């Protein structure tokens, strides 16, 4: 049925309906406008009136203006045709390339998979990136906190992850820019085109882009992660894939939720966050998981307010994380790429029961030697001098050329299988390459390339 606007207060719009009231979460379409204005039902106020949150600016709205109940929550194009495209929170193309011509659409509000659908399988998602796989491996259906941002090669790591997962698992990616700076959204898109992870000329794109930009109202920025989630859910639940979902960044998800809660007049909780902080987080996060059909695995850029790890926002988020990838400027200034901190990055599935016994020991060994190296940096005996030379060559072997960096660096990128990663670091820990130089281990793939680089330095 058709309702009428009765109140406009900023990004909050009240609509009165004579017949059937739209349920909470339903998308309403404002009539008589240039571009599509969507309102999401938030509350039933009584007296046939609903409170709604606007997805775009509310300037120019008049009391009595007509509003159509769409009969469902926000519904967006899902399918292969989203790949390489950029949509907004309401599923519109924003890349000026025409309609996203999918054969299916899907509601952005969906319940998390039921208990019976849970896969008790604790499986590693191989990224083909040496630091990640060995020392802080990704778990299928898990969430990974990505720390850092500027000058530490975040976007290149993202694109290589997109590349590697598609190449090795046949799984696609979704990038959700939550509070995306428009300049950086433009940059990312063009960097993806140049790296080849988006193709504008054929159907071989590996990522669907979903942007909720910073200049959009609280409602839009709060829901855009769910839009990304819904695109990802299609590839898992319809095509049985192991899907990657990027959320950049998870704090601005929480921030937009807080803004929305404030606008709806809800009393703020500790530190000014929404009272629904945990439930807002949980209903989104729980959709990221392994099910019987496949999985969605999620890399989530985390901003930490006031560098306070006990702040309610990061504290609530951490409850959902299974791993961390810590990108460090200190590692970058040593020339090691990717600039992953091999000591700070952790993974719950670094457990002898889950990963190999070989995996666990080699990782624990590499962890111990790099720790011992920093301890022996202050101060050596024959046993100590042997471990210092081994750990330095292990520092270099954690570096790796990326396929995504091939056009810029000129050097060939390497995707390293799990077992090749493990054996390479293992053999250094056993000292099979103590006879070989130090800089022969810098920027190679499998350990055989390090042997090949050592021959070239003769």
């Amino acid at each position: 049925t058709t309702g009428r606007i009765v109140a406009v207060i900023g990004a909050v719009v009240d609509v009165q309906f004579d017949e059937g009231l739209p349920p909470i979460l339903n998308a309403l379409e404002v009539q008589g406008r240039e571009t599509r204005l969507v309102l999401e039902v938030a509350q039933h106020l009584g007296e046939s009136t609903v409170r709604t949150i606007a997805m775009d600016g509310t300037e120019g709205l008049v009391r009595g203006q007509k509003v159509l109940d769409s009969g469902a929550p926000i519904r967006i194009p899902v399918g292969p045709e989203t790949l390489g495209r950029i949509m907004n929170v309401i599923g519109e193309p924003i890349d000026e390339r025409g309609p996203i011509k999918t054969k299916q659409f899907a509601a952005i509000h969906a319940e998390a998979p039921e208990f019976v659908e849970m896969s008790v399988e604790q499986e590693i998602l191989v990224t083909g990136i040496k630091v990640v796989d060995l020392l802080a491996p990704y778990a299928k259906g898990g969430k990974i906190g990505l720390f850092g941002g500027a000058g530490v090669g975040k976007t290149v790591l993202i694109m290589e992850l997109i590349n590697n997962v598609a190449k090795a698992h046949g799984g696609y990616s979704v990038f959700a820019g939550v509070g995306e700076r428009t300049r950086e959204g433009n940059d990312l898109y063009h960097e993806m085109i140049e790296s080849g992870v988006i193709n504008l000329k054929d159907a071989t794109s590996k990522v669907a882009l979903v942007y909720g930009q910073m200049n959009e109202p609280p409602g839009a920025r709060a829901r855009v992660a769910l839009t990304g989630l819904t695109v990802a859910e299609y590839f898992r639940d319809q095509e049985g894939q192991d899907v990657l979902l990027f959320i950049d960044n998870i704090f601005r998800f929480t921030q937009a939720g807080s803004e929305v809660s404030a606008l709806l007049g809800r009393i703020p909780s500790a530190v000014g966050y929404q009272p629904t902080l945990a439930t807002d987080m949980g209903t989104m996060q729980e959709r990221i998981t392994t099910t019987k059909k496949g999985s969605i695995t999620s890399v989530q850029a985390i901003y930490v307010p006031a560098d306070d790890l006990t702040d309610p926002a990061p504290a609530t988020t951490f409850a959902h994380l299974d791993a961390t990838t810590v990108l460090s400027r200190a590692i970058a200034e040593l020339g090691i790429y990717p600039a992953v901190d091999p000591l700070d990055s952790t993974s719950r599935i670094m457990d002898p029961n889950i990963v190999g016994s070989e995996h666990y020991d080699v990782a624990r060994g590499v962890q111990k030697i790099l720790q011992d190296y920093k301890s022996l940096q202050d101060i050596l005996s024959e046993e100590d001098k042997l471990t210092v030379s081994r750990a330095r060559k292990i520092q270099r072997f954690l570096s790796q050329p990326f396929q995504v960096a091939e056009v810029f660096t000129g050097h060939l990128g390497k995707l390293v299988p799990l077992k090749e990663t493990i054996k390479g670091f293992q053999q250094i820990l056993a000292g099979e390459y103590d006879h070989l130089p130090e800089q022969a281990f810098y920027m190679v793939g499998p350990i055989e390339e390090a042997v090949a680089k050592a021959d070239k330095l003769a």
């Binding site: 990004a11 924003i94 428009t182």
Partner: protein, 487 residues
């Protein structure tokens, strides 16, 4: 006629609640019987909450309020250059009407993803610390942030004064038109500001938009957007504009007043839930356009005032997150003699090298690393008399480079002059000189190379770097000059 008009139900604290006006649009400007304008921010079932653009003594219960087809726009164009205007583009300098032929809405959407290209053209401040370590390009949004009296406005004023050389030049491309938005300041402060720019001969390419402390809250709320629209005229016509919002802390306070008095729900620090949206809408309108759209740009330098150094308060947090980078100023740095009081360690520009000329790029990379290395060790500079030569050299070099980032006011530098000074520090020529004499050295050194070695400086800019021959000539000038200076 309660569709196109209404009556004041109540009036207080700059809020008129109006009965009727059934056909008013959200955010539409309406007119009171006295002639005062108001913006319709709250459309409610039984009333319109109207914010008053003036003194509410002139509004009484029962007063008629009318729709007028009003559009909240401002004059735009080259005729505003050299002029001081209020939040609505009315001349307040007493020099008569603005000769404006074009106008633009104050509330417009930013360009989206597609019309943009990556920021790549330097926006030169002429301030060594910024241009070398926190580089700004055209289309960037770079925050200037710090406590009261830490030197925030001065960064902006030097930046504006710096554009004179490009603007007096013939390279139509390097030219940058400037807009200074004063929000919540006292009128005499703004007068001192304009005197400074006039004496610098900077007014002729600058527009001053001013909504001062005694101007009603909605006027202070609008001023940034008005300034922005004036900037956008240049951006969309293949030209380049620089806008300064001094400051957004005061604009947020004005908006909070209105929001609270409209009885919108208070959040942290009593700010409304849409306060981020307030600044993000504004700051996204600064952009770099691709060639298909004329290739113009609008660069924004918002200013934020922190309280007791709290960069994690609500409004600072918002603008920090929105922008492409931040220049952090600190009181202890200021009084220690670090002026401009930039904390280089914390300050950032995500655009980075892309905004730097080859000449600057060849010296800034080294200075960045040597200072970074110095920062790990600086804690025991007055306590490390015994430690080994390597860490002694880090302190010696780092203390010297720190002095070279000091700069006086009102004399922004050409890039060639900047790199010539940074060259002397990074190649080690000042490593033996007493740290407390470096500022005095640079003043005299720069005056010497400008006065007599204009061929050398020209060559540095001609080549776009310091060549071997330029390096040789610089080594002889510096080493001989230093000997005479430390006598």
């Amino acid at each position: 006629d309660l569709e196109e008009t209404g009556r004041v139900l109540s009036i207080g604290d700059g809020i008129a609640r109006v009965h009727g006006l059934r056909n008013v649009q959200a955010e539409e400007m309406v007119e009171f019987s006295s002639g005062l304008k108001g913006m319709s921010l709250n459309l409610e079932p039984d009333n319109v909450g109207v914010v008053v653009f003036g003194n509410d003594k002139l509004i009484k219960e029962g007063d008629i309020v009318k729709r007028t087809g009003a559009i909240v726009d401002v004059p735009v164009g080259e005729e505003l250059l050299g002029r001081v205007v209020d939040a609505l583009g009315n001349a307040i300098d007493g020099k008569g009407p603005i000769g404006s032929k074009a106008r633009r809405r104050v509330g417009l959407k930013a360009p989206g993803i597609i019309p943009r290209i990556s920021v790549r053209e330097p926006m030169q401040t002429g301030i060594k610390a910024v241009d070398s370590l926190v580089p700004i390009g055209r289309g960037q949004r770079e925050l200037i942030i710090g406590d009261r009296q830490t030197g925030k406005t001065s960064i902006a004023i030097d930046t504006i004064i710096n554009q004179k050389r490009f603007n007096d030049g013939t390279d139509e491309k390097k030219k940058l038109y400037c807009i200074y938005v004063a929000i919540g300041q006292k009128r005499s402060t703004v007068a001192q500001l304009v005197k400074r720019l006039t004496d610098a001969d900077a007014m002729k390419y600058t527009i001053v938009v001013s909504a001062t402390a005694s101007d009603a809250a909605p006027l202070q709320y609008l001023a940034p957007y008005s300034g922005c629209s004036m900037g956008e005229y240049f951006r969309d016509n293949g030209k380049h504009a620089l806008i300064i919002y001094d400051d957004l802390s005061k604009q947020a306070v004005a908006y909070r007043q209105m929001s609270l008095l409209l009885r919108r729900p208070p959040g942290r620090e009593a700010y409304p839930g849409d306060v981020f949206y307030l600044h993000s809408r504004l700051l996204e309108r600064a952009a770099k356009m691709n060639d298909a759209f004329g290739g113009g740009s609008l660069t924004a330098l918002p200013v934020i005032e922190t309280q007791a150094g709290d960069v994690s308060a609500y409004i600072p947090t918002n603008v920090i997150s929105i922008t492409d980078g931040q220049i952090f100023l600190e009181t202890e740095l200021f009084y220690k003699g670090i002026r401009p009081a930039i904390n280089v360690g914390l300050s950032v520009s995500r655009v980075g090298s892309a905004a730097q000329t080859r000449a600057m790029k060849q010296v800034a990379g080294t200075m960045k690393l040597e200072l970074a290395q110095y920062r790990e060790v600086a804690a025991f500079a007055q306590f490390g008399s015994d430690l080994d030569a390597a860490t002694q050299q880090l302190l010696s070099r780092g203390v010297r480079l720190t002095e070279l980032l000091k700069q006086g006011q009102y004399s922004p530098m050409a890039i060639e002059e900047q790199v010539a000074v940074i060259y002397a520090g990074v190649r080690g020529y000042l490593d033996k000189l007493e740290p407390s004499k470096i500022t005095k050295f640079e003043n005299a050194f720069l005056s010497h190379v400008i006065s007599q070695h204009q061929a050398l400086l020209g060559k540095i800019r001609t080549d776009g770097k310091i060549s071997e021959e330029s390096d040789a000539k610089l080594k002889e000038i510096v080493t001989n000059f230093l000997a005479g200076f430390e006598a």
